[PDB]
Subunit: 212 residues, 2 copies
């Protein structure tokens, strides 16, 4: 009942996606926008790796696919500043991390306060960090899942938006669990982005209120 | 294909349940045994509180319902030794904690090594300890659940047997979440006990291998 009518759609957003490899999650975002499930468009996809398949997914969808080389910058902060700058040139409203295997620094957090999302393969707060699927199997849990959350300075500590659980089967290999979790990730990442775009996410402390 | 035939059923077990109050989980155990879902019988129910409704559930099911007063013993260890002793008089093969709000000590761990189960209202390792439902709501998770695990000396650190997840709804009160989790607890506690009785649980490190 706000910002929407025949000629105007004020909540539409421009999404910038950061990747490092296959970019499986990027695919769901691209399709969601194309098929109208996500109110917005993927403005650009940036990879910190030149030979990432995610960039090919981007090209096939007609989205600008860029590669920015960290080794071409003097420091980590410098790289993040360049990233942030490039994202702004595309007028990005929401940054979504999809397999981006690098920590977000002050420059990015500053350029996109409360506007950077990430999808993590575990039911946070359990198993933060890398190889969460393996962490789950090693710990012996019987249930695992994924988490979409706002990104803060701390490793996987940001406000939780959506979570989805999956069973852990006896004999599950890390890849078996990775796949099962991935199937949920493809579902909740687009939903989280839509909720963001609809202005239905309200951060309070480390929690997220989801409006009706 | 082992220990079972027309006249013999070697895996049947005698269950001893410890409670402190309502004993909601005790009910599922009692019914499971009565209706034949659990291969065994509840031999005795012991409460550390005289006016616990769980004891009434026990009497109605025809099970010995006992109250042992901690204040009648000189120490915590002393109380646990008395508990263990009473359980042995009933020939208990498996001790199941159902709302028992006291830590298990050396005497009990010694009398029932790898034979004490507990049901915890969270998806361990997340939120161990008391008021796990409230811990979940305060942290802001969107998924929670319960965990059935073998009990070790450390607070809710034992090998995980089964877990069940439930959604956390916007506006959930602690009781709302407690109820939703409880519905799953009533399902997996009996299943975990049956698996134990069937000799299908193999502890390896902090993990549990569940046989076919």
């Amino acid at each position: 009942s706000s910002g929407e009518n025949l000629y105007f759609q004020g909540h539409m957003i421009r999404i910038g996606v950061l990747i490092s490899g296959s970019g499986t999650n990027l695919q769901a975002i691209l399709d969601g926008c194309r098929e109208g499930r996500i109110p917005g468009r993927v403005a650009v996809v940036i990879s910190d790796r030149a030979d990432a398949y995610g960039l090919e997914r981007a090209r096939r969808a007609g989205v600008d696919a860029l590669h920015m080389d960290p080794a071409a910058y003097p420091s980590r902060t410098a790289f993040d500043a360049a990233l942030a700058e490039r994202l702004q040139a595309y007028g990005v409203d929401l940054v979504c991390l999809a397999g981006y295997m690098r920590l977000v620094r002050g420059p990015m957090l500053t350029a996109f306060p409360n506007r950077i999302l990430n999808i993590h393969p575990s039911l946070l707060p359990a198993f933060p960090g890398l190889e969460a699927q393996r962490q789950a199997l090693e710990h012996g849990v019987k249930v695992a899942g994924c988490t979409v959350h706002f990104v803060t300075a701390g490793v996987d500590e940001g406000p939780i938006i959506l979570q989805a659980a999956v069973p852990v089967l006896e004999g599950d290999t890390v890849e078996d669990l990775r796949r099962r979790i991935l199937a949920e990730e493809h579902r909740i990442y687009p939903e989280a982005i839509r909720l963001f775009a609809e202005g239905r996410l309200v951060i309070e402390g480390r929690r997220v209120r989801i409006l009706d």
